[PDB]
Design a protein around this ligand. Structure first.
Ligand SMILES: O[C@@H]1CCCC[C@H]1O
Ligand SMILES: O[C@@H]1CCCC[C@H]1O
Lengths: 145, 144
């Protein structure tokens, strides 16, 4: 994974400089764990997670069940964050995630722009925006949308 | 339309509070014009535009040609920005675009997070992120 031409240094991952910005980058690092039990600790009881525009998960239980299900069929091999930034309580991450389908071994790069809302240091919202054309095939589970 | 549960007032459109934020919002209003000649004026000369992960357009010529082509087959009927905000020189719009295919009259809602980089008030980068599953059907152009 190369740095893209449009990558700007003023917003690079290495220059995170709010606590919310730093917690999110930690969370990006933990994605490769493929471990919902570990990942769920970042969330508040009042929280949400959505791969747009698939049906969102609301509540920590739903998020955990959703993440646990994903890791049954796909591995997060790599996460490259190009930009981190934040504004009006929201944090933004422009990045690429590399995903590998466990049953096939096929890998997939997904260009992603994610938004996270934090309250007292814990995720109360996480929405990822990307192309789901290959996501159906990458994730051997029905999308629900 | 909409107003999602996750919509924060703290980051709403009406609360845009920098010149760049003000500009991207005006650019967002302008999209419904479907007029590539009017839109290209927001763009700097050294610039790019991409619907991820389709082949990007680099330079003002390519960008205008790309928008003009899009407006040949599709209308932008509505743009609804729920969040705008900025950080480290970039602007972010969390929004919905309604696109109507001209040959069919079929309409489409796209959930979108876009990043903008402006220079001296001019667009030097614009990348929209969203599901392209219906994009192919909605836009009667070949995908590259
Ligand atoms: O982004 C990925 C989607 C599928 C697996 C878990 C999640 O982190
Ligand atoms: O296809 C639509 C038309 C307007 C701008 C590009 C894209 O969002």
């Amino acid at each position: 994974i190369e740095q893209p031409r449009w990558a700007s240094k003023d917003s690079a991952a290495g220059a995170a400089s709010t606590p919310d910005e730093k917690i999110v980058l930690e969370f990006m690092d933990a994605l490769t764990s493929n471990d919902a039990a570990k990942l769920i600790e970042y969330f508040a009881e009042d929280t949400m997670y959505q791969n747009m525009p698939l049906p969102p998960a609301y509540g920590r239980d739903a998020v955990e069940q959703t993440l646990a299900g994903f890791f049954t069929v796909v591995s997060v091999d790599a996460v490259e964050t190009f930009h981190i930034g934040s504004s009006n309580g929201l944090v933004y991450t422009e990045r690429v995630d590399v995903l590998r389908a466990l049953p096939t071994g096929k890998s997939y790069n997904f260009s992603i722009l994610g938004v996270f809302q934090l309250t007292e240091g814990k995720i109360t919202g996480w929405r990822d925006y990307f192309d789901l054309r290959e996501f159906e095939e990458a994730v051997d589970l029905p999308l629900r949308g």
